[PDB]
Amino acid sequence: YDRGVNTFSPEGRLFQVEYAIEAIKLGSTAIGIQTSEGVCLAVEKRITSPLMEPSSIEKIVEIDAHIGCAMSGLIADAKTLIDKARVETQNHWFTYNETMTVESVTQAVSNLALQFGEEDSRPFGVALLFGGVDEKGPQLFHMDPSGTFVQCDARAIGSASEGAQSSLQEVYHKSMTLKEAIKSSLIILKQVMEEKLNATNIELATVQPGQNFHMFTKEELEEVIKDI
């Protein structure tokens, strides 16, 4: 009874979606931190080849001009979720002349991830981190293949997910600043990855209230790493 999305267990819960949670584990790590000054975000690349072009590997995509994103797990299912998440923020501005809030973005995203066998296919294999600054300030959210949606203050997913969480709960507090949280995030990264941390293994993305631009760092990132 463990090969069907249309079949329960004697105890409870799928396994099917439980197996879809396991597909996240073989991804890459990603850390996002919510701070009152804004939301920073970090990820690991895992570049395989030197001939492999680096900017064709995306981990941070721009959903909207005040909302970033992060992903892990299956790359093939991720590009489907990013597509409508750009469209649903665009349909909302067309009919309301306003920016869709960061919480209500994922409401539209979770409404299709819970449609895998509930029409009249398989569940997805990708967890997502959504950071953005809406009218309620900076926000940071999290979802899963099971459509379970929640708000987090600082979250780390992918591979090395549980090992990051124990060290990440140690140093977080409410009165952080943005420039402190950036250098606090990649102390965790060089302790959980196996290669030496340089300017080519990671990439950053921030968002601020008055600086809704710049969900990326372009070589400034070399200044942060050299002062670790």
Partner 1 sequence: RFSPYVFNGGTILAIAGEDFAIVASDTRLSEGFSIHTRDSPKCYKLTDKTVIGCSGFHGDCLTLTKIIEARLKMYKHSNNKAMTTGAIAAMLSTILYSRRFFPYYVYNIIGGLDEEGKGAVYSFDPVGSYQRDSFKAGGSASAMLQPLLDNQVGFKNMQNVEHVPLSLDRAMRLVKDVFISAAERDVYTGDALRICIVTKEGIREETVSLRKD
Partner 2 sequence: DRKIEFSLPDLEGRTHIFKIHARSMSVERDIRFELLARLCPNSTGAEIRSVCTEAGMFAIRARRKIATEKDFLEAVNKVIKSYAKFSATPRYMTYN
Partner 3 sequence: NQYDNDVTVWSPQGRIHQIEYAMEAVKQGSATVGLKSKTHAVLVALKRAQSELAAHQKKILHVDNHIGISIAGLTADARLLCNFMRQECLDSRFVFDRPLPVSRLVSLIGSKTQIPTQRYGRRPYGVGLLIAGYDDMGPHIFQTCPSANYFDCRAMSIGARSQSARTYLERHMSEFMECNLNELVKHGLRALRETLPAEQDLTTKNVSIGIVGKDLEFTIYDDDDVSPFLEGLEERPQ
**Site for partner 1 (CB under 8 A): which residue of 6, 55, 56, 97?**
97
Q: What does R_g of the chain's alpha carbons equal in angstroms?
A: 18
* CA–CA dist 224, 64 (Å, integer): 26
Task: Name residues contacting partner 3, limited to 117-176 (CB under 8 A).
Answer: 117-118, 120, 142, 146-148, 150-155, 165, 169, 172
| Minimum distance from residue 33 beta carbon to partner 1 (Å) | 24
Stretch that binds partner 3, among 76-84, 107-115, 184-192, 194-202 (CB under 8 A): 107-115
Q: Answer with the entry of partner 3, partner 1, partner 2, none that 50 interacts with (C-beta below 5 to 8 A by kind).
A: none
* CA–CA dist 178, 114 (Å, integer): 35
CB closer to partner 3, 119 vs 227: 119
Query: φ, ψ for residue 137 (rounded to 5)?
Result: 95, -160
Amino acid present at 20:
A
How many other β-carbons are positioned within 10 Å of the β-carbon of residue 201?
18
**Site for partner 1 (CB under 8 A): which residue of 6, 48, 95, 175?**
95
| Minimum distance from residue 152 beta carbon to partner 3 (Å) | 5
Q: Answer with the entry of partner 1, partner 3, partner 2, none that 160 interacts with (C-beta below 5 to 8 A by kind).
A: partner 2
Question: Please, how many CA atoms are within 13 Å of residue 140, restricted to the half-sphere of its CB?
Answer: 20
Q: Answer with the entry of partner 2, partner 1, partner 3, none that 175 interacts with (C-beta below 5 to 8 A by kind).
A: none
Are the CB atoms for 30 and 72 separated by under 8 Å?
Answer: yes
**Site for partner 2 (CB under 8 A): which residue of 25, 101, 171, 224?**
25
Q: Answer with the entry of partner 1, partner 2, partner 3, none that 9 interacts with (C-beta below 5 to 8 A by kind).
A: partner 3
Helix, strand or coil, per DSSP, at residue 110: helix
Long-range Cβ contact pairs of 97-100 (< 8 A, separation 24 or more): 99/64, 99/66, 99/134, 100/64
Report if residue 74 touches partner 2, rule: CB under 8 A.
Answer: yes
Q: Residues 6 or more apart from 52 whose CB is under 8 A from it?
A: none
Task: Name residues contacting partner 2, limited to 148-187 (CB under 8 A).
Answer: 159-160, 162-163
Report if residue 90 touches partner 3, rule: CB under 8 A.
Answer: no
**Site for partner 1 (CB under 8 A): which residue of 48, 49, 51, 96?**
96
* CA–CA dist 127, 29 (Å, integer): 11
CB closer to partner 2, 78 vs 102: 78
Tokens encoding 205? 């993305």
